[model samples]
Target: SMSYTWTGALITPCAAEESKLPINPLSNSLLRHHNMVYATTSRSASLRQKKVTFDRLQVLDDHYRDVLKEMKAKASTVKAKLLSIEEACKLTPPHSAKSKFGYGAKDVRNLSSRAVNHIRSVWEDLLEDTETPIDTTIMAKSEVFCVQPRKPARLIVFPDLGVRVCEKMALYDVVSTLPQAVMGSSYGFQYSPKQRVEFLVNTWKSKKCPMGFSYDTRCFDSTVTESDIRVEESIYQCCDLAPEARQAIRSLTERLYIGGPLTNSKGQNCGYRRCRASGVLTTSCGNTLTCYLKATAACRAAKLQDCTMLVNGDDLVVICESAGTQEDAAALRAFTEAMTRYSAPPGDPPQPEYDLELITSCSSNVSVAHDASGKRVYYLTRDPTTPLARAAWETARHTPINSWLGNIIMYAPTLWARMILMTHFFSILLAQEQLEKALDCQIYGACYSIEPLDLPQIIERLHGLSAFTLHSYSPGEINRVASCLRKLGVPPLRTWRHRARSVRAKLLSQGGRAATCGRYLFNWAVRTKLKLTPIPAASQLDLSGWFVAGYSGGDIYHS
Candidate 1:
């Protein structure tokens, strides 16, 4: 049978298996919000098929060549070394995936004999077979949104056992630093959430652009071909490497990066693949560079008027000068052709809008919401599906981190995040007695260990006094929120608000950090405001013009 490759079709069972989780007390809380979440397609798929194709710019200038040369230099100096068994094992979080070798993350963390022996075996296998490819399991990703026909389950493919450890040693550091060198400030993760918003504001305000649009590629990972994979590796090879690093990168690329297979939870051979896996270390770098390369060339072909681009992996928003409506349409058709020729067809077709606030990228939209004191505020929000879903998962069992809680801190100023997300997660964390424990999570793929109490500073730093007040929700924003809630099974906006009041009273009584939480996290729900704490400039990490970085909100920069 020709069923060896995962074309994303084999990822369905995970979503279907959602019904199998036994109904528990948390089910009531989650099911309560079930009605609020309604499924909706992220982008409308109504646009016509683009009849467009454009050639790449073969001759590169010194400026472009200079940038490429710099990237090669950084790559040449790259020295990735393998970690010891203990060191690698320690890096594996307690909540990481369980091994089929009969040990879970906790057992591995505790240094159980079986787990250690099994991990050692895996590590040995990784070291022994540097040339052969490794197979990875495919699992469906969880989302806050309900299943929609247009949106298939996202498949997360990852190496199992030894291959995973090898991947970490080979590419983790490279992934973190390589993309930044190549893309410079264009690297999306470099910006704090506030900085992202600030950049967007400054860029848009500077232009008062008539047409702004973000391009969305369908199945971005799957879209990467064998050639694309090699191209990425070639870029890595451009880096100076320790002899071990060079060999490791080659071995890892052949065995893991180029392609892998899909296995389901019950050990079904779902399929194999020919594209880059989402969970791999090279995913960010590959996607960013590939997307940048294609888009940069395509922009020239389309001849977009006044084009200024900001690309974060696959999510690219281009603010360009508007030609007349007819010419603008024609130019967009040319742009689509350019991208399609480059194997980067748009999933939702290219969305063209005049207003900066109207552009949506990475599922976030810039819009106005009323803060606690009824003052209008500008902020970014995606409908709270993933947040709610993670919360649901946390309620059922142990999750290393509550993404909902983290999102609450980063997005504290937004209307839904402040009242609903904050109230719900804090209530759960308090009941679970895990509020004070520092837990691991990722912001832009960077590891962070933060307690629930650290939010006042995080919120202050990220949103800068905007999180505490009432914010207005425009009718368009309201519609999206209601739609998202209905699909994701959350209670309506009214119900979340009501719950916030109840939480406010309870949190107010706790005093100290809990009081700080009540005032800042639920700042909108309370009358008396929480006094803000100031983070010193000296203490700021080199997060470049952002307030103090890191979970501690102190001086620690290097993670």
Candidate 2:
């Protein structure tokens, strides 16, 4: 079946969409090349549709079945609970799309009678009408990146709030617990950036002659088939669940989970989707399971030895023992062939990599840098192109997503993120005195509300105190950052250091949390730095669900 069946309707935007990154006073301070940054809009939706819509073919053999049985055995040991209406409502993000039944995300979060009553109706309808396809809203996502071959906007398909709440009630617990239970260390969401890099380093060292590769599936959501979705359902079914939970799962599987009708923001019937819905609650879990299954089978067919995989939804990285240069290359080709037969072909052909630093997964690569004590530290880093572009966007105007904060938290140890993202953003926030304001950012797809003042503790807990004192960076890492700075037309590091000293003095003038932030975050800028120590609040910080799963388009926010 075709991934999508389209009608002659355009995907209209809900509000005015900005295509080019607008320049502000702060923009040039961070990036001089404003023309390099561009944001995707609805105008390019058709191009995206053309790229994603295609017929898929899947062939499962004994190896696939063998992996399936092993997965089921692990899944059978788990038990999941059904969430109550009130419980599900709390997980909904405040800015999530409103229901057509006349209630919004705020009302749902507040558990208003109107929202509760409508949610009950949606759930009851789900139990009764198992075969009817659910209605979904499709919108073009606006994301920032450097100008290259202009890529079209990625489409996000999600159901109404009432149905979305029902989905959480039925599958939230299962998704939260099952993937980790079954995949164990292989589950990518189970680790923070620090832990993830550690795992990659350890796994690479454990292999006699490590050969690794990161697999990029071409539009993974569109590659999902009805059979693949059903297989995911079967895995969930293996778990011990409540009767209502079981019924809701079955109804959702046959109705919304497999496929649905796509409606635009302008209330026009845009098309139909026979592929994975990007915005559903089960999307992350479903994709992780499906990708893991196919890749496990492919590894067997390729005859790879001691395979250690890290799978976060469709982002996959495999580190395994190498036979030889020729053998490793041939085995990778065989793996690609097997994956293609399973209907999950690569966007870029996989290549055998001998060096761990060169293998990029989840858009991050492991790199080495020296700490304050001259001890080598392995940390996760990525291309600063997207991060810098988004940072420039945030400085110009307030956007819903705060990628700068997310990058700071995830890549705090990197030379670029610290000297550039940290210094530049703090200078702006301090000037505006919005340092205490809490901002929203996604980590592993789950929404988190974090304050700028908590950086001392947050950085301590996630990356450690070394993130504050790290100085000498690897030549390759420095070169990449320097090249990115030049490409984006960002100012040299010397200018940022001078600016950081001024920002640090201003922050220190204000006492309490502001002083703490200045003392720790900007220690590198000052010659006479205060001795860094473990923050007491760092141990008390609640980071339990921060790296548990990927919820990219899932309408989820943690309190």
Candidate 3:
């Protein structure tokens, strides 16, 4: 949740009109019934936030402290370093969101004094003083995805450039490293799509059986009231910070958290806000820590035994022993009350489920397919809404192939992903000669810029033998995937399979990039598979936590 910031909205799709729906569909009946809270000013929203979300409840007990001990110890190891102001400035990307500070990301990359000095001075203030909170400019962000055609685009809503850069120097290491330690295995980023499937399936197969359900927190970030925002600050206070680190948190709270101005496009003043901003550097750490604390205390309160959770920002799933439907239902009800009093109410209340595969987290599902030997296989996938939206954008323009395609490459083991996202984008990319261009796309919320030719190695490393050996999906899974593709104006599975053979043959016939691309990208379909010679660029990195050492999305700071 604590990620990028917003500037304004531009509902444009360039020349072609076919791409309009995927690009920007929010213009349809927005703020009409979205229940965006009828707050006119930021403080009004802030006051409502405090009244509803804040209260003296769920104090940390010794047991909770015991659980957090190792995490805090881990936090202590996460040292904060004062970055060279210009050096940090140099890391900003070109065509990045322009600063509300009247300079551009290009200026920072070019070392223009205006951008440098502004960033430098912010760094200095973080180092020299820490008492004052910084105010930020918030704007309506227009983010499009695959689900837009079904529903209006979910506005991501984040913060701006100058504060974003400073956030990196202050909290990047802490946010990137702390959650995995704090939550341990419950940390969502620790598992791959394939690993997640195995964990859920194995757990579900147990004697007691795993009861799993995903929690939906209502405005988890915005509802972070003043006190809960202070919860992370208090955690920071318990730790060792350099003279600068201590002050930066305090200053950030007052400036960005205590409140800021909200603006819509056209420069109209939307309101003032006091809750924690999702776009700030400390957002990820704060949200994770706060949610962990609430959930721990709540679980203890409900007495749910052997409860294991996986959390990604507000997207949460819990697996625990099934003591029959009635007991589990009551426990979840208690859990809901605890969460409500603690101020993180559920948008969708928790319910009991018998099958682990039926439970969805991060909007991904577990479905069955068949391998070449006709054995049943299970994997994780989601509705192709966002990816199709992404592919539509990629289809119409010359930007990078996009994160959706990158995600398909990673989860090549999933039958739906292969037949849908993979074939669609690869067909277009191959036709346009865009494969070798090395487009930047995100997988597991991390930006990786690799050529389409590199998919062979990535798939091999990520999902192991499952990638190369997968085949026709389960009847139910195939039917749904086929329905989705036909609805989205794409080809059937058989057609994609035929194209894969052609693509496989072509890659073998060609040299260099094509050879490598064909060898890996189509290796799964071809009868003669090439050997795996892993590329160190992607193969060597540990993406189980933290993004790459650069920036992506509408925000920066990915180390």
Candidate 4:
């Protein structure tokens, strides 16, 4: 009983297996290049014969590597700088004032001036850096460089009343001109040319009011006169798209509420609430209503709906009811031309023809559909010139905030990078699966190539082996070997494959059929061995009390 049979240690054999495989014909070249570079570096004085050749290859490699490293460093530095700026900006509170009078006024003005000066300095620096010597011929003759600049939209805010107005301008208009329009003409001053005449009229009117009470046409009440004047003064608030400008913002809430495309939801308008004042009220829904009131007066004035404004595109096409007068026709033509010109850049894609389908009445609706391919098709009735139809068309033209959000999602590196990575990984997975399938059968076809190298013959020699093994080599070494082979004037091999000979031998020894062995090999290679690691779980993990012991146990143990 003491004498026992010898047993082998549980060891996984690391022997080369035989299989159908392609030969890497470039291996010799790669090895040559690696040795040459190493020798050139080591024996700088002695490598006189290969000095020119070795130095040229070294230069190419160094150039590419250096450029790549420099670009990466520059990108990293810019990213860090932007992050630092963002942090500093976040820590600093936005400019504001406790009071508009006294020392506060001077402080606010100085602060604002400082901020403006800083911005201007930054702009000037950027401009200076971007300046380049211009070629007179190119500047004069090239149509590409003859582009007219676009103007910014003008915004006017009445801060005291919390009211805002916006005027759509041609893209080429100057922004400085906006101030004049924002400071509207004073009704009282315009009516009376002289200050004395205005004062006399005011004095005469004051006689009718109670003693100690003063009368002014502009003043709501004498005691509140200062506040009234302040309220009438304009607030110079400039924004890319102010709230007033967004009054015409296309509504997608309804489209989102109803499961349909924007085209399908056209002509269906919804109401919007515009607030006039600041206060809070308890709503029946148990929500606190804040400083916003529905503009009932404006809503009433519009008369069509409770909503004060109509949501439409910034640009519109107004078709007149037959040109009755030359002035009317001219106005219509000018507006239409402006709309067309403003819609696209000069020399851009040709605009579509305007369709005008007349109807007996203006209330009939038309529907349009956009397919997955983005081709728009219309289902229209004979009567299409309705006001409702025009409104629908305008709404369709208006771009939504959601569209901008979608653009960001598509282009933002944070989102797009992940999408690209997933896509590449999925493709790799599919390719691996296909390759495994191809390897199952005996490969007799030529691994074709334009080069003279006999890749197929070399691969065929390795076929039907127990195993085919590739000694893991560093990528840099592999590339060096390849380059050396290329310099030797050797045509590189096309493709390669290998079989697991150990697994094949095991199956054969167990009296398994070829079909079964092939199936096992395919599954083992693809499903078991070649599967990618799953993405790591991103959720936070709580590791508390991992070493705590329960009282029920006689001995203390980690739980």
Number of backbone clashes in candidate 1: 39
Best of the candidates, TM-score: 2
- Whole-model Cα lDDT of every candidate shown, in order: 0.62, 0.92, 0.60, 0.19
Instruction: In angstroms, give how far residue 455 of model 3 lies from its true place.
Output: 1.3
Error of 3 at 214 (Å): 0.8
Which one wins on lDDT?
Answer: 2
Ranking by lDDT: 2, 1, 3, 4
RMSD of 2: 1.0
lDDT at residue 445 of model 2 (Cα atoms): 81
TM-score of 1: 0.79
- Clashing pairs counted in every model: 39, 1, 10, 19
Which lDDT tens digits does candidate 1 get at residues 388-423?
655665566555555766677567766667756677
For all predicted structures, in order, the TM-scores are 0.79, 0.99, 0.81, 0.15
Q: lDDT tens digits, residues 435-551, model 4? A: 122111010100111110111122112211111111232343345435433543322432111123333333335442332323222222332332212112212322122111111
Per-residue lDDT of candidate 2, residues 1-559 (tens digit): 9999999899989999999878688898889999999999999999999999999988989999999999998999999989999999999999888899999989999999999999999999988887989889999999888997477999999999999999999999999999999999999998999999999999999998899999999999999999999999999999999888898999999888899899999999999999999989999999999999999999999998889999999999999999999999999999999999999999998999999999999999999987789999999999898999999998898877799999999999998998999899999988887998999988878888999999889999999899999888888899999988988999997898999999999999998998888899999999997998888899998887898877877789997
Estimate, for each residue in 1-559, the C-alpha lDDT of model 3 and write its tens digit: 2222223333222122232433323211111112211112222232333332332233345545554564566666555554555555654555456877789878877878888778877777766655554544443233444432332322233456776677666655555556665576666666777777776677666637678788888767656766777666666655556667567767776666545665544455545555666555566567767777777767877888888776766677778887888898999999888787777788877888876656878788777766556887788876664555455555544453365666676568766566555655666666667777767666544445566776766666666655656676666656666666655555555676787787666666777767766666666665665565554545575544433221223254223
Of candidate 4, the 10-residue stretch with the lowest lDDT total is: 136-145
Candidate 1 Cα errors over 4 Å, as ranges: 1-16, 20-88, 100-130, 142-144, 147-151, 208-210, 261-270, 369-377, 389-401, 430-434, 437-441, 445-447, 473-475, 482-498, 527-559
